[PDB]
Amino acid sequence: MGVVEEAHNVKVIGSGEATIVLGHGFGTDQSVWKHLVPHLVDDYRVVLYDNMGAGTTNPDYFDFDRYSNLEGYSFDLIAILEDLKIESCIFVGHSVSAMIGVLASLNRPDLFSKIVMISASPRYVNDVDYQGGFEQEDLNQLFEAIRSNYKAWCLGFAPLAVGGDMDSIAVQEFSRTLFNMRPDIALSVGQTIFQSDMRQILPFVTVPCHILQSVKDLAVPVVVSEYLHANLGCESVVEVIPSDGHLPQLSSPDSVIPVILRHIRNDI
């Protein structure tokens, strides 16, 4: 199918102009969309892909310099869109993919008609005038746990990230995909994402954004949604969902999928 499409496990379901591209967050893969895709395929051409470094990708292709900032991932996204000859899409970005889509839209705004963000944050680290949810010391302890015993870290982190019942199928799934990453890649990518800062480029975004999140999200205080809405230079709307978890489209589909669908199907 071509090296880029093989390397990112690209799947295309359907045909036609109206196209939706779905990008996943850290520690999971395109399977995170399993409860959303069934409701899209009758009305849209649906494109799924995996971020390089996901456990479903070949670690030999993980270039630590290319992926030392989010720009490397945004170049991959543009490459996939171009390889598929997509002239315009709705982009649904989960977690880090929301910012990867934003960055891609700075370089090629023509390729995106809308960005729908789920569990997005432009900055996780707190400062005296900004609540991101984490103090640097707690990120440091997280990285040390990853380095010291990756499996043990995965088992303890997955229930916290997913929320809900610690024995749920979604917790089991995310524990598996987390541990599917190569431990050195997980550590490097975790540092790159948790230390990122996208706040300063938000005024330059022009593609309209829909900002969705669980009301209880381990890595995204609700004030972050309001920050994105206040500082994005594009038209935007916020909807906080009465759900728990950072992967709510996987773990609470009954309450979460209808919200995502409304924001995909309706413009601001």
From Swiss-Prot:
PANTHER family: ESTERASE-RELATED (PTHR43039)
SUPFAM superfamilies: alpha/beta-Hydrolases
Organism per entry: Arabidopsis thaliana
Single GO biological process annotation from the record: photomorphogenesis
Coiled coil: none
Disruption outcome: Increased seed dormancy. Long hypocotyl phenotype under red, far-red, and blue light.
Catalytic residues, chain numbering: S95, D217, H246
Protein name in UniProt: Probable esterase KAI2
UniProt main location, coarse: nucleus
Tissue: In young seedlings, expressed in hypocotyls and roots. In adult plants, expressed in rosette leaves, stigma, sepals and silique peduncles and tips.
Highest taxon listed in the record's lineage: Eukaryota
Subcellular compartments: Nucleus; Cytoplasm, Cytosol
Family: Belongs to the AB hydrolase superfamily.
Induction: By red light.
MF (Gene Ontology): hydrolase activity
Keywords: Cytoplasm, Hydrolase, Nucleus
Any GO CC annotation of this UniProt entry: nucleus
Gene name as annotated: KAI2
Biological function: Involved in seed germination and seedling development. Essential for plant responses to karrikins, a class of butenolide compounds, structurally similar to strigolactones, released from burning vegetation that stimulate seed germination and enhance seedling photomorphogenesis. KAI2 is not required for strigolactone-mediated responses, but MAX2 is necessary for responses to karrikins and strigolactones. Lacks detectable hydrolase activity against karrikin. Karrikin binding induces a conformational change.
Any Pfam family: Abhydrolase_6
